[PDB]
Design a binder for this molecule. Structure first.
Ligand SMILES: Cc1cc2nc3c(=O)[nH]c(=O)nc-3n(C[C@H](O)[C@H](O)[C@H](O)COP(=O)(O)O)c2cc1C
Ligand SMILES: Cc1cc2nc3c(=O)[nH]c(=O)nc-3n(C[C@H](O)[C@H](O)[C@H](O)COP(=O)(O)O)c2cc1C
Ligand SMILES: O=Cc1ccc(O)cc1
Ligand SMILES: O=Cc1ccc(O)cc1
Lengths: 175, 175
């Protein structure tokens, strides 16, 4: 097995991909923005907490800090092009609010088409190097019925990094 | 789309699955332990930071706090049974150190068969509800050149939650 010591940022930091990119929707007054975050993870079951790692360079970062509420939405492979688009333009230059969406119970914007989504209340923000982790408490749940709560076979959009997307294979295995 | 408000822990917390389970390797003196963690994510590129979220209930948790160093290793679909096994028994009841493995540059144990692994130095630990986030700085990188392009198409092990695994589909897309 090849190895090297770290001397700075890695030539590629993709060894732990693919991952589901969570689409993070945030609204400040009338302005709605979305951006994908593949750096995301469950953080607690009881109580239910979920985190997104967001660069202070994103227009979304400042919006999270103002609103202190957001959505995290999980989309099917069929929306790879829209997801990539949201991840390739900034709300500083284009109105991503025109992407079809709806407002949740807490007034957070949820991108239409997802198989599931959380409404979150921001609890803490932690700086770790060049991104801040936004830790949200799940206060509502959206679920597209028909897709134990686990998303259906081959449905989930996967991101591999550097503009490359996939989906899970249809076959599953339960040891 | 169905929705409900959260009233406690969710009926299932799998909406954001599947993900890659990181195998978390830890060594304290002579004792070596391994624990899968599907709550994992990148947290910074420069410097390179990687996080794993670990219940205080895992044997591994105490070992991390003593060692303050650890491996995170990423395994091909072929090692699904062994990954699951490491995830369904405790170092309190079996010597998981008998799993074939090697010691890296910093002394952390790395589970053999990985297509990639990181040696990490523990930087910070944060409590979020019922798990602690271990934030490590990547100080060395292992790569199985033959198994990577990232894992090569369909290689990656995916966990969907509650004993159900998969792998990515071979076909990818880059718009
Ligand atoms: C699939 C995908 C995953 C992404 N994940 C993240 C992430 O976890 N963190 C982040 O800061 N940016 C991430 N990005 C970059 C943002 O999505 C991108 O910079 C976006 O255009 C920012 O929009 P904004 O400036 O309107 O907030 C990702 C992009 C893509 C395509
Ligand atoms: C696929 C998979 C992913 C897992 N992810 C996590 C995780 O992110 N956090 C956690 O605390 N436990 C997780 N677990 C549970 C531990 O892997 C499991 O409790 C293991 O028995 C702990 O071993 P230990 O007591 O020796 O540390 C996971 C288990 C499996 C099978
Ligand atoms: O996976 C892609 C990615 C892009 C920007 C980030 O800030 C983090 C991850
Ligand atoms: O997805 C499985 C899982 C198990 C235990 C955890 O603590 C977190 C996730």
């Amino acid at each position: 097995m090849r190895s090297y010591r770290a001397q700075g940022p890695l030539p590629g930091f993709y060894h732990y991909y693919p991952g589901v990119p969570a689409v993070v929707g945030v609204r400040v007054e009338e302005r709605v923005n979305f951006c994908p975050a593949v750096w995301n993870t469950g953080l607690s079951a009881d109580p239910p907490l979920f985190g997104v790692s967001i660069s202070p360079k994103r227009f979304t970062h400042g919006l999270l800090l103002k609103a202190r509420r957001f959505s995290a939405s999980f989309h099917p492979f069929g929306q790879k092009d829209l997801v990539h688009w949201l991840g390739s333009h900034s709300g500083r230059e284009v109105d991503k609010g025109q992407a079809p969406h709806f407002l949740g119970h807490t007034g957070v914007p949820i991108l239409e088409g997802a198989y599931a989504a959380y409404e979150l209340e921001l609890l803490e923000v932690h700086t770790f190097g060049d991104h801040d982790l936004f830790v949200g408490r799940v206060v509502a749940v959206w679920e597209e019925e028909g897709l134990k709560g686990r998303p259906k076979p081959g449905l989930a959009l996967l991101y591999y990094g550097k503009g490359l997307y996939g989906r899970p294979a249809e076959e599953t295995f339960a040891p």
